[PDB]
Write an enzyme that holds these catalytic residues in place. Structure first.
Site, PDB file in Angstrom:
ATOM      1  N   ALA A 191       0.587  -1.168  -0.187  1.00 59.64           N
ATOM      2  CA  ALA A 191      -0.107   0.032  -0.002  1.00 59.64           C
ATOM      3  C   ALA A 191       0.760   1.410   0.078  1.00 59.64           C
ATOM      4  O   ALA A 191       0.388   2.634  -0.706  1.00 59.64           O
ATOM      5  CB  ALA A 191      -0.907   0.081   1.159  1.00 59.64           C
ATOM      6  N   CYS A 192       1.981   1.254   0.508  1.00 58.23           N
ATOM      7  CA  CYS A 192       2.683   2.495   0.940  1.00 58.23           C
ATOM      8  C   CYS A 192       3.893   2.742   0.228  1.00 58.23           C
ATOM      9  O   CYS A 192       4.814   1.622   0.252  1.00 58.23           O
ATOM     10  CB  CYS A 192       2.965   2.446   2.403  1.00 58.23           C
ATOM     11  SG  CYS A 192       1.491   2.049   3.529  1.00 58.23           S
TER      12      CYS A 192
ATOM     13  N   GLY B 127      -0.247   3.835  -2.517  1.00 58.33           N
ATOM     14  CA  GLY B 127      -0.593   5.312  -2.083  1.00 58.33           C
ATOM     15  C   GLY B 127       1.294   5.919  -1.743  1.00 58.33           C
ATOM     16  O   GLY B 127       1.854   5.114  -1.023  1.00 58.33           O
TER      17      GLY B 127
ATOM     18  N   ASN C  75       3.784   7.534   3.868  1.00 63.16           N
ATOM     19  CA  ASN C  75       2.868   7.193   2.942  1.00 63.16           C
ATOM     20  C   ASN C  75       1.709   8.493   3.342  1.00 63.16           C
ATOM     21  O   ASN C  75       1.645   9.045   4.315  1.00 63.16           O
ATOM     22  CB  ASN C  75       2.382   5.875   3.035  1.00 63.16           C
ATOM     23  CG  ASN C  75       1.934   5.638   4.425  1.00 63.16           C
ATOM     24  OD1 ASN C  75       2.406   5.782   5.502  1.00 63.16           O
ATOM     25  ND2 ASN C  75       0.382   5.281   4.530  1.00 63.16           N
ATOM     26  N   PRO C  76       0.683   8.358   2.430  1.00 68.02           N
ATOM     27  CA  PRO C  76      -0.479   9.263   2.673  1.00 68.02           C
ATOM     28  C   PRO C  76      -1.293   9.206   4.073  1.00 68.02           C
ATOM     29  O   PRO C  76      -1.867  10.383   4.416  1.00 68.02           O
ATOM     30  CB  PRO C  76      -1.672   8.596   1.565  1.00 68.02           C
ATOM     31  CG  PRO C  76      -0.587   8.093   0.482  1.00 68.02           C
ATOM     32  CD  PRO C  76       0.530   7.710   1.237  1.00 68.02           C
ATOM     33  N   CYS C  77      -1.439   8.130   4.728  1.00 70.41           N
ATOM     34  CA  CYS C  77      -2.040   7.891   6.017  1.00 70.41           C
ATOM     35  C   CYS C  77      -1.226   8.242   7.113  1.00 70.41           C
ATOM     36  O   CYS C  77      -1.545   7.966   8.543  1.00 70.41           O
ATOM     37  CB  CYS C  77      -2.876   6.904   6.053  1.00 70.41           C
ATOM     38  SG  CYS C  77      -4.353   7.051   4.906  1.00 70.41           S
TER      39      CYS C  77
ATOM     40  N   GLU D  89       1.327   6.326   8.612  1.00 73.65           N
ATOM     41  CA  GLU D  89       1.822   5.334   9.382  1.00 73.65           C
ATOM     42  C   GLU D  89       3.004   4.934   9.191  1.00 73.65           C
ATOM     43  O   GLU D  89       3.673   4.000   9.899  1.00 73.65           O
ATOM     44  CB  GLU D  89       0.641   4.239   9.574  1.00 73.65           C
ATOM     45  CG  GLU D  89       0.499   3.180   8.432  1.00 73.65           C
ATOM     46  CD  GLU D  89      -0.331   3.518   7.486  1.00 73.65           C
ATOM     47  OE1 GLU D  89      -0.682   4.754   7.249  1.00 73.65           O
ATOM     48  OE2 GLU D  89      -1.099   2.711   6.778  1.00 73.65           O
TER      49      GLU D  89
ATOM     50  N   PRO E 131      -5.048   2.683   9.316  1.00 70.86           N
ATOM     51  CA  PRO E 131      -6.388   3.022   9.349  1.00 70.86           C
ATOM     52  C   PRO E 131      -7.468   1.696   9.187  1.00 70.86           C
ATOM     53  O   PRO E 131      -8.399   1.712   9.961  1.00 70.86           O
ATOM     54  CB  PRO E 131      -6.716   3.887   8.367  1.00 70.86           C
ATOM     55  CG  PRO E 131      -5.362   4.208   7.813  1.00 70.86           C
ATOM     56  CD  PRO E 131      -4.423   3.036   8.057  1.00 70.86           C
TER      57      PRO E 131
END
Ligand code: B12
Ligand SMILES: Cc1cn([C@H]2C[C@H](O)[C@@H](COP(=O)(O)OP(=O)(O)OP(=O)(O)O)O2)c(=O)[nH]c1=O
Ligand SMILES: Cc1cn([C@H]2C[C@H](O)[C@@H](COP(=O)(O)OP(=O)(O)OP(=O)(O)O)O2)c(=O)[nH]c1=O
Ligand SMILES: C[C@H]1O[C@@H](n2cnc3c(N)ncnc32)[C@H](O)[C@@H]1O
Ligand SMILES: [Cl-]
Ligand SMILES: [Co+2]
Ligand SMILES: [Mg+2]
Ligand SMILES: [Mg+2]
Lengths: 607, 611
Positions: free
Chosen positions: A133-134, A162, A306-308, A310, A476
């Site tokens: 994801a990251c 992301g 990354n976007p969130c 973490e 998340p």
């Protein structure tokens, strides 16, 4: 109880009609005609488990005869753990597992699988087979590097990644450009291009607190609708706190510009606070704090998340995530540390294998992931777990339990990485990492569990054998927690009820079915239990939602987890609509004093 | 008169106050510290001539013991032609020649130059040494290709290039996308990204084919994309499209990587275009099929797009450098001095072909495409002023016959020069597979309006054997270089006889020489007000007739002049079809149909009072 027992209790439990929508919506694999190749969660579990167990092909510890057996074993265990929804990998893994692979291999009964079959899965993974994801990529100070990055963005987004970047290398607006004798657009203007790029194909944009354009950046949204923005603090957190308290001044400067300027750090903070108060952006990224615990620093350096938020990542690095649903580990007023330990070992192996069968759109990313083998093992179901243990989220009890739970996972995660480093080989960069060049290097703060001493030792052992540079995060889990019919990541439930009506599955089992019918009218209206008459006190106290929990109580829960997470954590600091900008500043000031590595706030009813 | 004597007549004529302002603003080179290294047009001419002469180092017919004298002679001739402003290369040449070179080498007196000075110049050309105006790049139907093209736009634009693309490869909006089961955003959406990219680099051509499923959306795209000029592409034969219109037929909008398929009345489609152009002047029409009919490398290679101003049709990654002859300076007692012109065409072709050798491109594919084709864009400016001097009305058959003949003459000698340069320096690598060698009687333009046709045919047969360049001619807007030369732009009529830009007075100098100075002070006020002599009383009918401005000239005469020139131009031509405010959408449609019948390779209209 044994993990195998726990699997029995769950493996036959189908997803709620709710989760089933999400699955039919975007997880069930469809062919080119559009028809469904998968129609039940079980089908997904089989495809993914088979793909990730294929990695065991590379395992140098397995004799060729047993090789088929070992693989089949991991597929089964991955499969069972996946179907029971005890652990689930990030969405990209569920989306993209097996893409490019023949449709007659991904589902057929495991008793029919031959070594030929697995070898074939490995070879036929296509350029879309992207399971992480990251991402972070650099954006160098030139037109060439800038537009290479724009392309990188589009390539990563295409495959479901992301991506984030620190844009501070870009020289300030108005700066001299030698090549045209003109003036530079500045980072904020270039960010508009990245935004435009993505709008046709989710983003993290970071600018450092000492960049001459920081003020324009802080107000950049009021356009850049696809960006989350955070302000970067590459210096020690202590240092900024000190400056703030002394009401000191910060020098804005850049290497490739004559543009420089003094600004009061307090005014800068107030600008950030005001904007966040208005809209939830920008956040704070304590980059210096991330590097403090980065095992490869300073040979390599974390510049962005990354976007969130973490995962802190160095240039071109990517990370794959997965979470364990801990609410499923509740057993008679206790967390089942026997089953959970087993599952941690399995999950770390699964995640580490994902790297092997992963395909990245860029060769520099492939290299960086192979060098570090960073993983992101986390949890979901935490809030619901507290509901079962009858512990208020906003309490020291909750936070001690949290730190303890994370510590256990942290310990067994790094234990497992030790064994995996032993069985399969260390990550190539172990040798130049602080796990080797330092004594007593610990990837995180600790200091809230009895487990510390045992963690401190297991770190010593990873001096010799370590498969992964870092292992843990709290994401998340927005989507995978809906699939696992549980609460999201480490967040409290936002609501206990909402419209077909839904009521939290655990509240449902404690509260008098009678009362539930009466109050529900009011509950969905007021989004809380605390001002609803004739509800047992200890139910109002236990079944707290996000907005019942005050800003500091959110922060300190983040602190508690972060002490045992070597990556970062996704945590929204929710805030009452009545909060003031000063209340936001106080969260920032407190945050500087805790061990959190980033801050995100959202004031209720501000957007 | 010998060119050398025409040079003496012009060489010490100082650029106007207006031209010098422009030169100071943008062309006089400066050091990193904003200080002027050049203060006069003479300095620009020395610099450019020297840098372009340096190409002669690579000349395989010169011996190591003669190169210094040959190079100096070329610098000398280049210099005098430039200083006199008889020929001026496209702006990027003026801007970037010399970039990278020690400042004590670029303006050193020619008699002091050594062979090592020239080799040092040659070696010190830096990555910004980009001397060509015109680029086309492909935009393939993948995310990879699209953003690789965006990167290229940024790089080309940085170094001073203008870039165009045909976006028709991009599958229609809503089309199936395999890798994501998602939906394609469509060419128009992606063009927004190219626009955003250019917005931060401190101009583009965007073409979509008529039969693309999103053509209707494309046509309405600006009614955002402020940096794009847009044209509709017609890759089929002009004849086929005219006939479909005349028969009231339908066109299949389709795409090979989409099930998105549709039928439309070619007449409704044309009216939509015409309606849009009527309001706003866009989109133009690009007759790609007609460009390919004359493209010596078709169909091995294919022209899919033009540069931003439309005058060069280019294959993928191809670039082209331009240069223009001010034909107004060749007027000599009632005639065009063809003796001097011939010599200048010969020198101009060599100069342009030399530019290729000292050019530096930001992308290897471009560098390769240019070396393989060596396409040139020799044009003219001062045409309208020349007609003023000859006392010929722009809007007459007499003017169009004159133009075709003038242009055929230049084309003949430019092409004869290419033969010569191919014999001397080597043919363009791809000659061997072009239609100059594989086909009999290949001519790269229509002809049919000159007594020069037979002679042009002969030279084209010759170039089967030797040929330095795939094509040589164009007519460019020459917006800035015609101002530097103090003459009218390209083949365009003067837009106004007296005006002001941003500032102050421009007053046509040929008007100022013919008209009675008494009557000039008289009407001067009315002229600027009314923008034309047409109906000012007390002005000689003779003068009224010759001194016509763009809007004095009806749309068909604009069109027919473009056709006259296009019959002898192997690339394309930049021409605005000016129309009166009273013009209707039907008037626009009629211009189109007539364009389909003539030999023009594209069309741009602008209705007075649109914007
Ligand atoms: C080159 C050019 C362009 C280029 C400019 C970029 C480039 N590559 O240089 C492009 C392709 C963008 C262009 C487009 C159009 N142009 Co034009 N363009 C010219 C041209 C030939 C050169 C002027 C120049 O470079 N001057 C030198 C510089 C130093 O002076 P400047 O005033 O600062 O130049 C700037 C402006 O003139 C501006 N500009 C360009 N077009 C137009 C049109 C108008 C109306 C205005 C106010 C400004 C303007 O671009 C220049 C800077 O790049 C002139 C005609 C001429 N004078 O030779 C027209 C001219 C101004 N254009 C004209 C028109 C109508 C258009 C279009 C609307 C028509 C169409 N069919 O598409 C479009 C749309 C853009 C617009 N007009 O707003 C007309 C204006 C008629 C009128 N009554 O105002 C002119 C006179 C051409 C003609 N033969 O009729 N153009
Ligand atoms: C060329 C160009 C660069 N820039 C910005 C982008 C980068 O942040 C920065 C550097 O651009 P570069 O492309 O690296 O510019 P340069 O190498 O020609 O000049 P220099 O050596 O001074 O860097 O300037 C613009 O804003 N506009 C432009 O037109
Ligand atoms: C991936 C993607 C493509 N597109 C458009 C851009 C191109 O015009 C076209 C092809 O993009 P591609 O990058 O080729 O997508 P793909 O190869 O995975 O799909 P396919 O094999 O069918 O080509 O789709 C989008 O608009 N959005 C997207 O997210
Ligand atoms: C005014 C200048 O603008 C150019 N121009 C504007 N639009 C187009 C187009 N669509 N195609 C080609 N040239 C165009 C014309 O070629 C003219 O030379
Ligand atoms: Cl406030
Ligand atoms: Co949200
Ligand atoms: Mg640079
Ligand atoms: Mg493709």
């Amino acid at each position: 109880m044994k993990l195998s027992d726990l699997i029995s209790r769950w493996i036959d439990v189908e997803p709620s009609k709710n989760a089933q929508i999400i699955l039919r919506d975007r997880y069930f694999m469809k062919d080119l005609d559009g028809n469904y190749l998968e129609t039940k969660w079980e089908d997904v579990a089989r495809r993914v488990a088979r793909v990730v167990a294929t990695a065991e092909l590379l395992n140098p510890s397995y004799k060729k005869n047993e090789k088929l057996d070992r693989i089949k074993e991991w597929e089964d265990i991955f499969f069972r753990v996946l179907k029971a929804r005890l652990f689930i990998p990030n969405s990209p893994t569920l989306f993209n597992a097996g893409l490019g692979v023949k449709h007659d291999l991904l589902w057929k009964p495991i008793d029919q699988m031959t070594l030929e079959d697995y070898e074939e899965i490995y070879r036929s993974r296509n350029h879309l087979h992207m399971l992480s994801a990251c991402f972070v990529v650099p954006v160098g100070d030139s037109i060439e590097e800038i537009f290479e990055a724009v392309k990188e963005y589009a390539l990563i987004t295409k495959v479901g990644g992301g991506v984030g970047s620190n844009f501070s290398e870009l020289r300030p607006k108005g700066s001299f450009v030698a090549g045209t004798h003109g003036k530079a657009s500045g980072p904020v203007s270039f960010m508009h291009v990245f935004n435009s790029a993505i709008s046709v194909v989710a983003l993290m944009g970071i600018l450092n607190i000492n960049h001459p354009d920081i003020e324009e950046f802080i107000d950049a949204k009021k356009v850049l609708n696809f960006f989350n923005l955070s302000v970067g603090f590459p210096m020690d957190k202590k240092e900024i706190l000190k400056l703030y308290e002394e009401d000191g001044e910060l020098e804005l400067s850049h290497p490739r510009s004559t543009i420089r300027k003094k600004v009061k750090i307090r005014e800068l903070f107030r600008k950030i606070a005001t904007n966040a108060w208005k809209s939830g952006d920008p956040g704070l990224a304590f980059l210096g704090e991330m590097n403090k615990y980065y095992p490869l620093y300073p040979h390599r350096k974390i510049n962005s998340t990354n976007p969130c938020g973490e995962i802190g990542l160095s240039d071109y690095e990517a990370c794959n995530l997965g979470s364990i649903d801990v609410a499923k580990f509740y057993n008679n007023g206790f967390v089942d540390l026997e089953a959970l330990q087993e599952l941690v070992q399995i999950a770390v192996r699964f995640l580490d294998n994902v790297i092997d069968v992963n395909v990245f759109p860029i060769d520099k990313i492939t290299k960086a992931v192979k060098e570090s083998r960073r993983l992101g093992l986390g949890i979901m179901g935490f809030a619901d777990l507290l509901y079962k243990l009858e512990i208020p989220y906003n309490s020291q009890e909750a936070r001690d339990f949290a730190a303890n739970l994370m510590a256990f996972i942290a310990l067994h995660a790094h234990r497992t990485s030790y064994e995996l480093g032993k069985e399969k080989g260390n990550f190539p960069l172990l040798e130049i990492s602080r796990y080797r060049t330092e004594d007593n290097f610990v990837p995180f703060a600790m200091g809230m569990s009895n487990y510390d001493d045992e963690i401190r030792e297991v770190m010593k052992m990873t001096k010799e054998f370590r498969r992964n540079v870092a292992l843990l995060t709290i994401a998340p889990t927005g989507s995978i927690s809906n699939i696992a019919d549980t609460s999201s990541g480490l967040e409290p439930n936002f609501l206990l009820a909402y419209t077909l009506l839904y009521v939290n599955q655990v509240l449902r089992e404690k509260l008098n079915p009678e009362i539930l019918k009466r109050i529900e009218k009011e509950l969905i209206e007021k989004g809380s239990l605390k001002d609803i008459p004739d509800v047992p006190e200890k139910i109002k106290k236990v079944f707290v939602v996000a907005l019942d929990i005050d800003p500091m109580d959110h922060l300190l829960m983040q602190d508690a987890f972060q002490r045992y997470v070597d990556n970062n954590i996704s945590k929204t600091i929710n805030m009452p609509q009545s909060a003031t900008v000063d209340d936001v500043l106080n969260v920032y000031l407190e945050a500087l004093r805790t061990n959190v590595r980033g801050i995100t706030v959202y004031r209720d009813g501000s957007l």
